[PDB]
Paper text:
Here we present the high-resolution cryo-EM structure of amyloid fibrils of the Src-homology 3 domain of phosphatidyl-inositol-3-kinase (PI3K-SH3). The structure of natively folded PI3K-SH3, a domain consisting of 86 amino acids from bovine PI3K, has been well-characterised by X-ray crystallography and NMR spectroscopy. Used initially as a model system for protein folding studies, PI3K-SH3 was among the first proteins discovered to form amyloid fibrils in the test tube, while not being associated to any known human disease.
A three-dimensional density map for the thick PI3K-SH3 fibril could be reconstructed to an overall resolution of 3.4 Å. The clear density of the fibril allowed us to build an atomic model for residues 1–77 out of a total of 86 amino acids. The missing nine residues are located at the C-terminus, which shows blurred density likely due to substantial flexibility. The thick PI3K-SH3 fibril is a left-handed helical structure consisting of two intertwined protofilaments, and is thus called DF (double filament) fibril. Protofilament subunits (PI3K-SH3 monomers) are stacked in a parallel, in-register cross-β structure. The helical symmetry is therefore described by a twist of 179.4 ° and rise of 2.35 Å, which corresponds to an approximate 21-screw symmetry. By encompassing 13 residues of each monomer, 26 in total, the inter-filament interface of the PI3K-SH3 DF fibril is very large. The protofilaments mainly interact through two identical symmetry-related hydrophobic patches at the periphery of their interface, between the bottom part of the bent β-arch motif and the respective C-terminal part of the opposing protofilament. A single subunit in the PI3K-SH3 DF fibril is not planar but winds itself along the protofilament axis, which leads to interlocking within a protofilament.
Residue numbers in the entry:
A (entry chain G), B (entry chain E), C (entry chain C), D (entry chain A), E (entry chain B), F (entry chain D), ...: 1 to 77
Amino acid sequence: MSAEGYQYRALYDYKKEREEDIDLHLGDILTVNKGSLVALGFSDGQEAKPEEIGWLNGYNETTGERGDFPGTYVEYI
Amino acid sequence: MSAEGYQYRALYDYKKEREEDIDLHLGDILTVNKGSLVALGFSDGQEAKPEEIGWLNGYNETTGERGDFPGTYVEYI
Amino acid sequence: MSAEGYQYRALYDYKKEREEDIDLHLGDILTVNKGSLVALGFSDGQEAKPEEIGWLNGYNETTGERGDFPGTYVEYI
Amino acid sequence: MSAEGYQYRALYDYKKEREEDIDLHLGDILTVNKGSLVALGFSDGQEAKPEEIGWLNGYNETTGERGDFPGTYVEYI
Amino acid sequence: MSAEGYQYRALYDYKKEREEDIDLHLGDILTVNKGSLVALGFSDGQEAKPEEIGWLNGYNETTGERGDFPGTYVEYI
Amino acid sequence: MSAEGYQYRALYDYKKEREEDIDLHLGDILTVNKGSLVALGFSDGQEAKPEEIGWLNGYNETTGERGDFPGTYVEYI
Amino acid sequence: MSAEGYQYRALYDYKKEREEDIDLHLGDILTVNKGSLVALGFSDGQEAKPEEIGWLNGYNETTGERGDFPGTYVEYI
């Protein structure tokens, strides 16, 4: 198993578990705004994205790309 | 197994589990705005995307690309 | 198994599981706006996309591309 | 198995599971606007797309492309 | 006299001159290409625009806009 | 006289001159390419714009905009 | 006379001169390429713009903007 490169997160997972009778309770979320609000530039104001998912066993991206996003791929063979 | 490159998330998952009788309760989400709001530039105001999914076992993208997005692919063979 | 490149998420999934009698309760989502709102530029106001899906076992894109999006593919063989 | 390239999500899924007697309850979504609203530019106001799907086992795109979208394919053989 | 703003070239010219018996000789321009040439992407090859003007006393634009050019004007009064 | 702002070139010219019997000789320009040339991406090859002007007393733009050029003006009054 | 701001070149010119019988000789320019050339990315190859002007007394821009150029103006009054 090999990895190289600049900024990478390479988890090599090997887990074997028996997990029984778990009760887990999170709680709720409240965001309140009262009053006059002015937001300027790369500001936000009150950015508030509610994402409620149950049973993540795969892959999830919630990707907010806000701005100016260039990308150049260059390969010589 | 090999990986290289600039900013990558290469998880190599191997998990074998038995998971029984789990009760899990999240809770709710409330966002409130009272008052006069002015948003300018790459600001947001109150951006609030509700995504409720149950049983993610595959792949999910919620991708908000807001702005100016160039992309150039260049390959020499 | 090989991977290279600039910003990639290469998950190599291998999972073998037995999962029984799970009760899971999420909760609800409320977004409220009271008052005069002015949104300018790449702002949003209150962007609020409700996506309720059950049993994601495959692929999902909710892709909001808002703005100016060029793309150039160039390949020499 | 090989992958290269600029910004890619290459999941190589291999999952073998037995999944029984799951009860899962999401909850509902409410978005409220009271008051005078002015939206300008690449703003939104209250963009609110309700997508309720059950049993995603394949592929799904909800793609909102709002703006100016050029694309050039160039290939030399 | 007032100026503000992001990237501006505000010349405030005040010149009072007496200019006599000037002899000025520029010379010529030659561009030669020999050989096989392949140009790809936002490349050029040999872009070679000959502009010969005499006695510029006003305004001149030779503007080569090659590509993808969006522009949005937004004004609230 | 006032100036502010981000990246500006504000020349405030006041010049009063007597300029007599000047002989000035520039010389010529030759660009030669021999051989096989391949240009890829935002490359150029041999970009070679010949601009010969005599007696610039006003304004001149030779503007090569090659690529992807968005612009957003946003003003609240 | 006032100036402020981030990166500015504010020349406040006041010049009063008598300039007589000047002989000035520049010389010529030759660029030669022999051989196989490959240029990739934001490379150039041999970019070679010949600009021969005589008697610049005003303003001149030779502006090569090659790439991805966003600009956002935002002003609240």
